Amino acid sequence: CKIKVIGVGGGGSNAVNRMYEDGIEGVELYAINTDVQHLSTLKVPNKIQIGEKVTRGLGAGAKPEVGEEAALEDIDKIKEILRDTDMVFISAGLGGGTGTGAAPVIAKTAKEMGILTVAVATLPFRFEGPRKMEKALKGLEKLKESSDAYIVIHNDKIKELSNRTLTIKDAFKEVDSVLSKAVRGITSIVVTPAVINVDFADVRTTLEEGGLSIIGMGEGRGDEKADIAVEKAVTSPLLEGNTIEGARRLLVTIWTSEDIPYDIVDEVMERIHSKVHPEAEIIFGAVLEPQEQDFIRVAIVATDFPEEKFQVGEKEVKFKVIK
Numbered sequence: 112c113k114i115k116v117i118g119v120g121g122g123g124s125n126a127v128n129r130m131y132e133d134g135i136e137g138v139e140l141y142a143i144n145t146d147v148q149h150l151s152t153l154k155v156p157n158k159i160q161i162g163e164k165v166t167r168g169l170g171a172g173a174k175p176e177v178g179e180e181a182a183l184e185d186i187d188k189i190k191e192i193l194r195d196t197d198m199v200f201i202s203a204g205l206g207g208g209t210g211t212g213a214a215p216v217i218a219k220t221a222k223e224m225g226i227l228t229v230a231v232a233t234l235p236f237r238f239e240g241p242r243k244m245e246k247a248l249k250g251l252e253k254l255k256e257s258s259d260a261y262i263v264i265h266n267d268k269i270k271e272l273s274n275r276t277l278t279i280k281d282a283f284k285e286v287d288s289v290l291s292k293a294v295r296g297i298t299s300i301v302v303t304p305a306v307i308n309v310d311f312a313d314v315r316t317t318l319e320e321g322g323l324s325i326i327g328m329g330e331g332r333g334d335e336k337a338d339i340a341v342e343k344a345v346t347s348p349l350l351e352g353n354t355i356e357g358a359r360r361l362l363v364t365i366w367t368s369e370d371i372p373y374d375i376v377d378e379v380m381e382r383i384h385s386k387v388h389p390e391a392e393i394i395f396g397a398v399l400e401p402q403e404q405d406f407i408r409v410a411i412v413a414t415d416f417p418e419e420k421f422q423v424g425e426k427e428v429k430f431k432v433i434k
């Protein structure tokens with residue numbers, strides 16, 4: 112099956128760049144930007160400019176309306192890259208211009224072509240200020256209209272799960288790491304020879320029209336690794352305000368070190384089912400984690416929530432109308 116990952120804007124491009132560096136296989140990678148200089152810095156195989164006319168290649172100046180116009184003017188370029196595609200991940204850092212503005216356009220284009228359309232969207236760190244968060248949430252409201260499922264990851268939650276960072280560079284490197292794990296978790300159980308593969312048809316039934324999606328990951332080592340990893344994953348969502356135990360459809364990836372047999376999946380899936388919604392439809396795959404030993408990582412993508420709401424800091428977020 113044909114999977115593409117498209118980074119939109121600087122943050123999205125950087126995340127996809129990390130996925131390339133992390134060795135994502137069996138998928139085609141693209142970076143789309145209005146900022147031609149940023150594109151020039153990337154290792155991503157396919158670099159695509161949008162908005163030459165309106166931006167002259169100098170970026171969107173953090174204005175979502177400009178990112179939107181860039182994508183609309185060059186919608187032919189976007190359609191071209193989307194031809195012959197089963198699934199696309201649209202990776203964007205919400206809160207800037209290009210990602211915020213163009214991501215909904217690209218997502219809509221893909222979804223109208225019948226491609227399974229999964230946005231992977233971040234909300235900014237608190238250190239980025241109130242205005243970037245406002246812009247992000249406004250853009251998210253458009254992106255949700257355009258997507259099958261939209262995975263929303265709040266950068267402040269990421270911050271919590273790793274070591275204190277001392278440079279903005281390192282803060283974002285951890286964001287890239289997490290996004291890369293989230294996406295590679297899904298692609299690798301479909302398009303590589305995995306420990307337990309899942310059919311693309313199952314990924315589609317799990318995520319199609321899923322809406323708001325929330326990820327949680329947890330590592331387990333040693334004798335009780337299953338219980339430990341599942342507990343950590345269910346209790347560590349990357350977005351507050353909608354517990355994973357409420358989702359009606361879930362996609363679980365169990366990363367295993369080479370020394371762990373596949374039947375660890377038995378205990379994992381028992382534990383997940385005990386913790387989450389009794390009626391949840393859950394698909395799961397398993398894939399090797401290199402350089403690890405006596406190790407699993409349970410990565411849970413939860414979707415199809417009763418209410419498409421969430422919390423960021425002290426703000427409870429609800430959108431105007433859920434399709």
Ligand SMILES: Nc1nc2c(ncn2[C@@H]2O[C@H](COP(=O)(O)OP(=O)(O)O)[C@@H](O)[C@H]2O)c(=O)[nH]1
Nearest residue numbers: 120121122125204206207208209210235283286
């Ligand atoms: N994952 C990741 N996110 C980033 C990075 N740099 C910035 N961001 C996030 O992306 C959001 C938008 O910034 P950016 O993508 O540069 O703006 P755009 O190019 O106009 O879309 C920011 O508010 C950050 O939260 C990065 O290197 N990696």
